[PDB]
Write a protein that binds this ligand. Structure first.
Ligand SMILES: *[C@@H]1O[C@H](CO)[C@@H](O[C@@H]2O[C@H](CO)[C@@H](O[C@@H]3O[C@H](CO[C@@H]4O[C@H](CO)[C@@H](O)[C@H](O)[C@@H]4O)[C@@H](O)[C@H](O[C@@H]4O[C@H](CO)[C@@H](O)[C@H](O)[C@@H]4O)[C@@H]3O)[C@H](O)[C@H]2NC(C)=O)[C@H](O)[C@H]1NC(C)=O
Ligand SMILES: *[C@@H]1O[C@H](CO)[C@@H](O[C@@H]2O[C@H](CO)[C@@H](O)[C@H](O)[C@H]2NC(C)=O)[C@H](O)[C@H]1NC(C)=O
Ligand SMILES: CC(C)CCC[C@@H](C)[C@H]1CC[C@H]2[C@@H]3CC=C4C[C@@H](O)CC[C@]4(C)[C@H]3CC[C@]12C
Ligand SMILES: CC(C)CCC[C@@H](C)[C@H]1CC[C@H]2[C@@H]3CC=C4C[C@@H](O)CC[C@]4(C)[C@H]3CC[C@]12C
Ligand SMILES: *[C@@H]1O[C@H](CO)[C@@H](O)[C@H](O)[C@H]1NC(C)=O
Ligand SMILES: *[C@@H]1O[C@H](CO)[C@@H](O)[C@H](O)[C@H]1NC(C)=O
Length: 1781
């Protein structure tokens, strides 16, 4: 079994090598795919980012100055890469090095000191006393002390010394930025054009691009509120106070203008300044000043120089600088809108005013209070308010998350930070604080800070994940090509009956399947190894062992090969299977991507039950590979095992299914599973049949060695069954068959080793040479190398191709040479018993004679068993003819015995009065009669038993005597043929219709034929109507699940919008009662917010009742010992872990347990979430470590990891001045209703609104889109509930905030309407792909009818092919229209207002109609150049899909492009659909906004140009299709057969040309309707033709299910429908059966005898000599008689043939042979047998009387028993004419 496997492997490798066309592409396709993949990979490098923290943002309630400082400088999330000091639980600053803060603190200190200072009083007292004494010295000392204290207080500021330097340095790109960052924080018709171009150059400068967007809605915006309720009025007045807190710079200009002259005259010409300047320079005061100054700068000399009078830095310069600064800050503040408060009556007017202000580019958010009942009391204890703002300034409310998870803290300052720079959080906090202050009436000041949670050193490698999760597509493209190739190969080897021949030679299917598996696995394994190598080298899958991926790809190759072995058992056409394999593989892989989208509810059992396919298992393996690759550790030898096990189970299942289907459902050739002469005993016996039986008798026949015995039968008895049983593959019955002494049922393998079989089909492999065939067959026989070479040389010498030009050439020989080689190949191995099956089927007589010579040369003891339907072959070759019938043996014996036992007498033929010759013959012969009389031919019959006494000689002498009297020109005599013995043993309409009505009749006939072939196709090509239907159905059901992408509902800001989350509360500095009560109110019965309190005022979220436990999670002993080691302080409280080392890219840092440090006490807060106490713990490090470890643990299980925590809280701790200011205002220059009073009040308010007792940091995760506002509302509600007194039941006390964006403007609606292409193009492509399936049926029907089936056969008669094409187009439109209408109704069923509208439906309908009308003729010329059916479907579908994708990409993107792309109807339909949807969307947007537009879609600009374009395109395409086709002596009753005007000629093609879906009578009815037969008598003509050509019992049956004889009879019936004067036939009886060819011959004779000549061409000379009368051999062409029949047999024919048999036997008589040789001089020994001789006499036919005389005289002397004399045949004359060429 090993040499056979080696031979099969060699044959497969040689088949693969000799092509040199598929293997190089099989190698280059995956190479190109992976090169494109690595080229795309090299363009997207991985994005690495270090771990970093974010600063804390200050809200307006935490002070105006810190809020402004946080807004201005740190507004870009610098991600400082280190824990900022603001994240510490104690300090909430990070603005300690600010200069503005120091200046404000120094100003506050100076203001507080100026009240207690009384130096002015002492100076006035000294001035009054001076205007020496005792109290004068004490007064002077007190004045000096006060002056020294004032100087020490003034010189300790040092704030203006830096601000002045900064402002002079302000008046190179990074220098100004650094100066601003140092001065701020740490490290047109409406307004004047001044602020206009100020803002213009601010937007035009690359310095405030991140600051102007945040400062625009602060000083330009405007706030509106509804309704006009006194409670709303109070809360908005509080908001206005909060806003005007920073209005101190407004009333400063008036104060400066009022206090400038006073201070000027006080410093210029006042006595106080004079006394101060006089007391500064002296002899003893210098030491006092030097001591009081403590060595600081600006000594007394500088003091006198600065405070001098009439003057380098004098106080006048500082005065002018202060004046200029006040002037410029007033000019800046002049256009700062601080009156942003507008009350509106109702909501719709508020929205209208909001849109109007948005059109004016000055509009901030608007508050809408719900449930107020205008006219009410202070508050209803539950305030509900919504904040409406522009969609470009707030986060979207349609979704709360990004969808698919990805690393990254989402900290973009502009794209995902609209809640900060948009102004939502600030205004929300202000409104919440105002509501709290109005509800409680308290004076507490609690600040709120926004701290963002840091991220633990993430990297971005999304491309790697996408490539590793979408691997199967690129991994299986080239493999789909390869499996298509191998499927084509398998189906080609199966269809050519090669597997049946291998099984006949003694081979099992197991070894064939194994050889195919190996030959398909070798190149697949090579490709898998190369792909593994290129993946390891190209850094596409690094840190991965090549061995595991190599074995994975090997298992994938094995399972794909077994899938192909399963699929190949369902097809019978090589090209069709090759085209369908890739589609089947694609639709079998599609389940993987279908399941990967809905994997949220996919269980393990469902995955296992769905893992019966190979692509889904490969996808699961690739997902596991990606999961183990994204963490940098890779996959090595250590899920995947389950995937490999499922793939092996799939291989086993595919193998079992293949073994089952091959047995139960085989092809059209397999078997499905649930007158006796004396036997010559002088030779050897090879086969012995004894009582063979079957399923519905007795067979006793013996075959001898040195004889070529025949086996005849009607193919209906037990002849073919017995021949098959003798060859094996069939279980025998209760009988015996001893082949060379071996029983069939006993041993079958020993018999097949020496048994040659030659079936009807020639067995020759393609791409192979004849010497390779000989070698392969000889090696499969079982011979050694020397015997193989000897047999090859002998066969090359015997066949007749001893030349290197034919031995090394492929199967390019003629049919005769191929048949001769196939016959000779059955004699390899020295087989002692051979069984032939119909040799020389359709070869010319020369190749027939050659094969006969080869068979006679291979007769030396080989037991040749002939089996053919030809009688002349079995007569001239069969030595013992055996004819059986009815399953039993009827006759057996030699040719002479069978002809002389039950045959008829000789047949004489005279070729030129018929009564004189008949009377003479009846006078000479006893019982003679006339057989036939045809044109120049008279044939009679004579009894063979008569004329034995010597009457033959006298008759021949009488004929030769008066031969010139009669008109006979030549005479001949022959014997009885074997065909007669085998047969003995077993349309007109009375008038023509050709004319004007003939065209209409042909049109209606073609339409009727097409309707009949389309109606009877319920099982055939009927999917062309239901497949586009379901395609459009699924395309529409896919378009009803996509959101409109233009809706923003009212989203309630609550932290419970997510399923599960973790919270935390950190009580820092637990020594204050306020922080303790705030923590209590935050962790009391009401809970965090308004989730559950006296009910559930939030939809679809009920609260839990009982959950209260302060428990700690267990900890292993390892971490316990690690932390008992010690040295774990606040700084570095846990072992950190590195991330993204060199050459190792890690998505998240992995490190051993103990990263968090300790499990904090967790407790469920009765709100579907748990909180953990983090008091006294490092918040940032703990959060980072817990987040990274939780994400790692959740990703290690592959459970679609999502966010873990969202928010947490950290509580901590941070009038006299006002009183002093009031005293100063009253004490000095007191006034009222002036600018000074207002400025002092504003300054006092600003100084008061900057100190906060306690504060809370709200840690929020920016991954949640609405996480900051939710927890802000929560902490505001907690602050509200903490400020309640006397126990007001804080359960029903809460504040609810909403987020509802305003209505979209015109531009936004236009962009939303235009952004629908991403949905429209998919529907357009799906509709195009569904509608491009109808013309494919028409084009494949045209291809099927084009290959000599119906086109040329109808063109033979007058059919006017233009009318044929017109009828085809009409029927295609009528078929296309019904399906188009059905699709339109299906579309109409659904409610798609974009199409069902009264202005979109008829235009949609006519567009589809025109698309069909234009696409029908486009594919018409594609059927011309296609010499294969059932294959253009997939190619044309791929071309249409490519054109559709090209049009879609062109529409995606221009005028000239759209103008020239109109030639494609798919592009036209796509553009029409796109324009229709766009017009509908624009009209809907205009109706929604309040406009009116009635633009009809039928305008020539939008839609209507494409319609005319497609119409003219279809017209010119039909014209081009019509023009392409055009490319711009035989007397009556003479069968003049060529032995090499349209309506009056009949034609019969060689190959059968019938439709497989029509009946027998319908064919002749259609052909009569085409031949000008009236519709009235067309049925009578059809019935007449049916009765003439037989098959009456099969008149109503599909012609496709007929047999060869039935198809030939149908062709003959069609050939004589109209009754032409001359009918042309080509091979009428080919491969038929006796008793059936005689019927066609008699029909032809009856046709020709009625005065209608026939012209028949064929290869069998027996049919020609039995039918034709004049062998018109047109060597020179045209018409030329070649001397009839008998004339040609007597003129150029050979001599006679005499077969003689001796009376004596055992074994023969040499004297008879000697006398026969001595009698005739030209006697040749044609065949010498035992008791049987035959001889040939050339050039001695004219003396036949003398030959008969000598035979009669020698019968008694030579002891002759039987004799026979016959003439030459027609095939002998043919080979004689062809041998001399
Ligand atoms: C919670 O836990 C985290 C870590 O788990 C703690 O964060 C640690 O403490 C500091 C955070 O404020 C970090 O100190 C910084 O370290 C930087 C690293 O630079 C190098 O440091 C190494 C020593 O590790 C030196 O040999 C090198 O020469 C480098 O200096 C320092 O650069 C940084 O110094 C600052 O530089 C800036 C700019 O020059 C100055 O303006 C500034 O004044 C300061 O000098 C600073 O020393 C520390 O690295 C960080 N991580 C670790 C592992 O310690 C938190 O502190 C914990 N929470 C609490 C409340 O303690
Ligand atoms: C809300 O505050 C604004 C300014 O903070 C107030 O507008 C001031 O008063 C009148 C307009 O009512 C103007 O003459 C002033 O110039 C405005 N600005 C300043 C700085 O005084 C407004 O009156 C306040 N409204 C309510 C209802 O309190
Ligand atoms: C608003 C009014 C009341 C402020 C009055 C205080 C002003 C006039 C005084 C107090 C402190 C003084 C400053 C003290 C220090 C210096 C640094 C020196 O190199 C230039 C002069 C300069 C800058 C002085 C300018 C004048 C000064 C700013
Ligand atoms: C006789 C042999 C040598 C030639 C056979 C032609 C083969 C190689 C060509 C002709 C038609 C081609 C197919 C046409 C359609 C498709 C569908 C597409 O989705 C995958 C490629 C696939 C499956 C092509 C594979 C290669 C193909 C089958
Ligand atoms: C900043 O912190 C320092 C301590 O390092 C402190 O002295 C200073 O007052 C702080 N600045 C503030 C709170 O503005
Ligand atoms: C805003 O949109 C809502 C949503 O339907 C609609 O009811 C309202 O009339 C619209 N208002 C304006 C001014 O367009």
């Amino acid at each position: 079994c090993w040499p056979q496997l080696r031979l099969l492997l060699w044959k497969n490798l040689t088949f693969r090598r000799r092509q040199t066309c598929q293997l190089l592409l099989e190698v280059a396709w995956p190479l190109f795919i992976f090169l494109i993949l690595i080229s795309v990979r090299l363009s997207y490098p991985p994005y690495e980012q270090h771990e970093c923290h974010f600063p804390n943002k200050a809200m307006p309630s935490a002070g105006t100055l810190p809020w402004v400082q946080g807004i201005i400088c740190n507004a870009n999330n610098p991600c400082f890469r280190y824990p900022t000091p603001g994240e510490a639980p104690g300090v909430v600053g990070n603005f300690n090095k600010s200069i503005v803060a120091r200046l404000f603190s120094d100003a506050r200190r100076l203001l507080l000191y100026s009240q207690k200072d009384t130096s002015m009083k002492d100076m006035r007292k000294v001035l009054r006393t001076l205007q020496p004494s005792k109290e004068l010295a004490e007064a002077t000392k007190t004045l000096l002390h006060s002056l020294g204290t004032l100087a020490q207080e003034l010189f300790s500021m040092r704030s203006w010394s830096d601000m002045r330097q900064e402002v002079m340095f302000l008046t190179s790109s990074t220098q100004i930025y650094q100066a601003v960052s140092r001065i701020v924080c740490g490290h047109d018709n409406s307004t004047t054009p001044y602020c206009n171009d100020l803002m213009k150059n601010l937007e035009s400068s690359p310095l405030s691009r991140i600051i102007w967007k945040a400062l625009k809605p602060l000083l330009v915006g405007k706030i509106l509120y509804t309704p006009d309720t006194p409670a709303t009025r109070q809360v908005m007045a509080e908001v206005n106070k909060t806003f005007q807190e920073l209005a101190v710079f407004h009333d400063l200009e008036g104060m400066w203008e009022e206090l400038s002259p006073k201070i000027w005259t006080f410093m210029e010409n006042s006595q106080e300044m004079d006394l101060v300047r006089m007391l500064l320079d002296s002899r003893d005061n210098d030491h006092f000043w030097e001591q009081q100054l403590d060595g600081l700068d600006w000594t007394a000399q500088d003091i006198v120089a600065f405070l001098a009078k009439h003057p380098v830095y004098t106080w006048r310069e500082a005065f002018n600088e202060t004046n200029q600064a006040i002037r410029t800050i007033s000019r800046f503040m002049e256009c700062v809108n601080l009156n942003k408060l507008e009350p509106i009556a109702t909501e719709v007017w508020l929205i209208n005013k909001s849109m109007e202000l948005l059109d004016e580019r000055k509009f901030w958010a608007g508050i809408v209070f719900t449930g107020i009942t205008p006219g009410s009391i202070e508050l209803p204890h539950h305030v509900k308010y919504k904040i409406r703002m522009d969609i470009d300034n707030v986060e979207r409310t349609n979704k709360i998350k990004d969808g698919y998870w990805d690393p990254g803290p989402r900290a973009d300052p502009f794209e995902d930070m609209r809640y900060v720079w948009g102004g939502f959080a600030y205004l929300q906090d202000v409104v919440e604080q105002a509501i709290i202050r109005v509800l409680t009436g308290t004076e507490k000041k609690t600040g709120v800070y926004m701290q963002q949670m840091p991220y633990p050193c993430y990297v971005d490698d999304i491309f790697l994940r996408v490539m590793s999760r979408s691997m199967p597509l690129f991994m299986t493209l080239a493999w789909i090509y390869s499996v298509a190739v191998i499927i084509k190969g398998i189906v080609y080897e199966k269809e050519a009956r090669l597997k049946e021949t291998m099984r006949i030679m003694g081979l099992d299917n197991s070894i064939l399947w194994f050889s195919w598996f190996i030959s398909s696995l070798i190149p697949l394994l090579v490709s898998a190894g190369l792909l593994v190598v290129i993946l390891k080298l190209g850094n596409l899958l690094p840190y991965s062992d090549p061995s595991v991926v190599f074995v994975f790809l090997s298992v994938f190759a094995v399972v794909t090969i077994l899938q192909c072995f399963l699929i190949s058992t369902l097809f019978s056409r090589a090209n069709l299977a090759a085209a369908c394999g890739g589609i089947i593989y694609f639709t079998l892989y599609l389940p993987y991507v279908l399941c990967v989208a809905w994997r949220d509810y996919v269980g393990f059992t469902l995955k296992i039950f769905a893992s019966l396919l190979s692509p889904v298992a490969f996808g699961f393996g690739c997902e596991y590979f990606a999961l183990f690759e994204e963490q940098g550790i890779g996959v090595q030898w250590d899920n995947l095992t389950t995937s490999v096990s499922m793939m092996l189970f799939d291989t086993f299942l595919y193998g079992v299914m293949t073994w089952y289907i091959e047995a139960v459902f085989p092809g059209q050739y397999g078997i499905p599973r649930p007158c006796m002469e004396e036997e010559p005993t002088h030779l050897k016996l090879g086969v012995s049949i004894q009582n063979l039986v079957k399923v519905y008798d007795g067979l006793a026949l013996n075959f001898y060695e040195g004889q070529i015995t025949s086996f005849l039968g009607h193919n209906g008895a037990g002849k073919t069954t017995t021949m098959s049983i003798l060859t094996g593959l069939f279980p025998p019955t209760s009988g015996t068959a001893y082949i060379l002494g071996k029983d069939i049922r006993s041993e079958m393998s020993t018999i097949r080793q020496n048994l040659g079989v030659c079936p009807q089909h020639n067995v020759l492999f393609d791409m192979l040479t004849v010497e390779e065939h000989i070698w392969f067959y000889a090696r499969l026989k079982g011979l050694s190398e020397k015997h193989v070479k000897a047999e090859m040389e002998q066969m090359a010498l015997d066949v007749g191709l001893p030349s290197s030009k034919l031995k090394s050439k492929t199967s390019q020989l003629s049919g005769g040479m191929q048949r001769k080689l196939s016959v000779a190949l059955a004699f390899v191995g020295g087989s002692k018993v051979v069984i032939l099956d119909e040799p020389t089927a359709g070869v010319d007589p020369y190749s027939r004679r050659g094969i006969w010579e080869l068979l006679l040369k291979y007769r030396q003891g080989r037991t040749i068993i002939l089996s053919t339907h030809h009688m002349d072959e079995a007569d001239v070759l069969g030595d013992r003819i055996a004819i059986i019938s009815h399953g039993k043996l009827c006759c057996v014996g030699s040719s002479l015995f069978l002809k002389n036992q039950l045959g008829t007498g000789y047949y004489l033929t005279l070729v030129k009065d018929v009564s004189a010759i008949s009377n003479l013959i009846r006078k000479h012969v006893s019982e003679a009669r006339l057989v036939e009389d045809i044109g120049h031919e008279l044939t009679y019959v004579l009894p063979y038993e008569a004329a034995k006494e010597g009457a033959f000689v006298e008759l021949f002498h009488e004929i030769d005597d008066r031969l010139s009297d009669l008109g006979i020109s030549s005479y001949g005599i022959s014997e009885t043929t074997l065909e007669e013995i085998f047969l003995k043993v077993a349309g007109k309409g009375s008038y023509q219709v050709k004319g004007w009505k003939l065209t209409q009749q042909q049109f209606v006939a073609l339409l009727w034929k097409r309707l009949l072939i389309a109606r009877r196709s319920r099982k055939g090509f009927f999917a062309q109507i239901v497949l586009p239907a379901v395609f459009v159905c699924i395309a529409l059901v896919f378009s009803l699940i996509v959101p409109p992408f233009g809706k923003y509902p009212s989203l309630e800001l609550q932290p419970w919008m997510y399923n599960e989350q973790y919270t935390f509360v950190s009580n820092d500095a637990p020594e204050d009662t306020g922080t303790l009560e705030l923590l209590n109110a935050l962790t009391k019965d009401p809970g965090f917010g308004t989730r559950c309190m006296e009910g559930n005022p939030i939809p679809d979220t009920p609260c839990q009742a009982g959950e209260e436990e302060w428990t700690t999670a267990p900890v292993p002993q390892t971490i316990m010992d690690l932390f008992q080691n010690g040295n774990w302080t606040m700084q570095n409280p846990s072992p950190a872990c590195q991330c993204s080392s060199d050459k190792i890219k890690k998505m998240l840092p992995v490190c051993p347990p103990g990263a968090g440090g300790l499990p904090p006490p967790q407790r469920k807060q009765n709100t579907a979430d748990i909180l953990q106490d983090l008091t006294g713990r490092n918040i940032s490090d703990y959060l980072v470590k817990t987040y990274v470890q939780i994400i790692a643990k959740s990703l290690k299980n592959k459970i679609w990891v999502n966010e873990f925590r969202y928010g947490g809280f950290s509580l901590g701790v941070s009038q006299e001045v006002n009183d002093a200011i009031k005293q100063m205002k009253k004490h000095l220059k007191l006034a009222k209703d002036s600018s000074a009073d207002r400025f002092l009040n504003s300054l006092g308010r600003f100084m008061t609104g900057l100190d906060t007792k306690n504060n809370v940091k709200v840690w929020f995760n920016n991954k949640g889109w609405h996480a900051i506002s939710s927890f802000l509302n929560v902490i505001n509600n907690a602050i509200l509930r903490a400020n309640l007194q006397k126990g007001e039941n804080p359960s029903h006390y809460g504040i609810t905030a909403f987020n509802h964006p305003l209505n979209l403007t015109k531009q936004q609606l236009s962009e939303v309407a235009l952004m629908t292409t991403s949905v429209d193009v998919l529907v357009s492509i799906c509709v195009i792909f569904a509608m491009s399936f109808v013309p494919a049926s028409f084009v494949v029907f045209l291809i099927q009818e084009r290959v000599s089936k119906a086109k040329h056969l109808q063109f033979i008669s007058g059919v006017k092919p233009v009318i044929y094409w017109l009828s085809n187009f009409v029927w295609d439109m009528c078929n296309y229209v019904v399906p188009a209408t059905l699709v339109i109704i299906i579309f109409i069923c659904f409610q798609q207002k974009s199409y069902v509208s009264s202005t979109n439906l008829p235009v949609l309908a006519l567009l589809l109609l025109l698309y069909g009308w234009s696409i029908t003729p486009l594919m018409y010329p594609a059927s011309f150049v296609f010499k294969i059916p059932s294959t253009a479907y997939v190619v044309l579908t791929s071309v249409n899909l490519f054109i559709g994708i090209n049009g879609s990409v062109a529409t995606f993107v221009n005028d000239i492009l759209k103008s020239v792309f109109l030639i494609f109807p798919h592009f036209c339909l796509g553009r029409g659909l796109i324009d229709m949807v766009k017009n509908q969307a624009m009209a809907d947007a205009l109706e929604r906004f309040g406009e009116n537009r009635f633009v009809s879609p039928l305008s020539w600009d939008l839609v209507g140009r494409n319609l005319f374009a497609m119409a003219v395109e279809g017209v010119v395409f039909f014209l081009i299709t019509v023009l392409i086709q055009y490319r711009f002596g035989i007397p009556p009753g003479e069968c003049f057969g060529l032995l090499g005007v349209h309506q009056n000629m009949g034609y019969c093609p060689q190959f059968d040309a019938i439709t497989e879906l029509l009946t027998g009578r319908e064919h002749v009815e259609f052909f009569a309707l085409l031949r000008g037969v009236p519709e009235k008598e067309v049925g009578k003509v059809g019935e007449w033709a049916i009765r003439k050509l037989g098959l009456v019992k099969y008149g109503e049956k599909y012609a496709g299910n007929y047999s060869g004889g039935n198809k030939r009879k149908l062709s003959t019936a069609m050939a004589l429908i109209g009754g032409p004067p001359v009918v042309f036939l080509d091979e009428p009886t080919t491969g038929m059966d006796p008793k059936a060819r005689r019927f066609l011959w008699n029909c032809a004779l009856s046709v020709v005898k009625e005065g209608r000549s026939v012209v028949l061409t064929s290869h069998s000379m027996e049919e020609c000599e039995a039918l034709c009368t004049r062998m018109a051999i047109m060597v020179n062409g045209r018409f030329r008689c070649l001397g009839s029949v008998q004339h040609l047999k007597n003129r150029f024919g050979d001599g006679y043939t005499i077969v003689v048999r001796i009376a004596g036997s055992n074994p023969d008589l040499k004297p008879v042979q000697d006398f026969f040789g001595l009698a005739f001089p030209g006697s040749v020994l044609k065949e010498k047998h035992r008791n049987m001789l035959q001889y040939q006499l050339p050039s001695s036919l004219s003396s036949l009387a003398r030959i008969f005389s000598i035979l009669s005289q020698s019968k008694k002397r030579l002891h002759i028993e039987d004799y026979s004399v016959s003439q030459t045949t027609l095939d002998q004359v043919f080979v004689n004419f062809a041998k001399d060429q």
